[PDB]
């Protein structure tokens with residue numbers, strides 16, 4: 005088939021992520037479990053909203069089914085593996101939420117495996133981005149968003 009995999013970077017319960025062997029700035033997130041079209045579309049849309057146009061695009065099979073996402077390789081080390089951070093990292097995690105929120109994103113999955121720390125730049129970058137939205141009452145979303153944001157901040161601050 006068309007997309008060419010490099011090394012496996014990692015995986016989760018939804019996908020295996022390969023380097024794109026044809027573009028060193030990209031990764032191929034290939035779904036191992038069924039995703040709804042809306043799920044994938046929002047994931048891609050959010051990644052582009054935060055990282056800019058052309059940051060993410062869907063990968064299709066020859067039958068027109070969504071089978072994955074080709075997206076920017078995000079720089080940095082997983083917070084899951086970090087056991088020490090500089091005092092400046094506190095300002096870095098704050099800045100990340102500020103940036104998301106300024107793009108209209110209320111980051112849902114605020115787990116330590118979903119952000120990377122770029123130590124040279126002192127930047128945290130989110131990997132998989134989805135947003136709370138009204139379709140969840142407003143008051144419930146705010147509580148749930150608050151909880152996640154403060155949890156992730158706690159993870160960071162405790163390494164300082």
Ligand SMILES: Nc1ncnc2c1ncn2[C@@H]1O[C@H](COP(=O)(O)OP(=O)(O)NP(=O)(O)O)[C@@H](O)[C@H]1O
Nearest residue numbers: 013014015016017018019021031076077078117131
């Ligand atoms: N755009 C990216 N750039 C660099 N690494 C990535 C990128 N996307 C995913 N990864 C890596 O691939 C691993 C797995 O990604 P992913 O499929 O999103 O599973 P997960 O979110 O960590 N676990 P799960 O909650 O079960 O889906 C991550 O831990 C990252 O290391």
Ligand SMILES: [Mg+2]
Nearest residue numbers: 066067068069
């Ligand atoms: Mg078809």
Ligand SMILES: [Mg+2]
Nearest residue numbers: 083084085086
């Ligand atoms: Mg740990």
Ligand SMILES: [Mg+2]
Nearest residue numbers: 016118131132
């Ligand atoms: Mg993920």
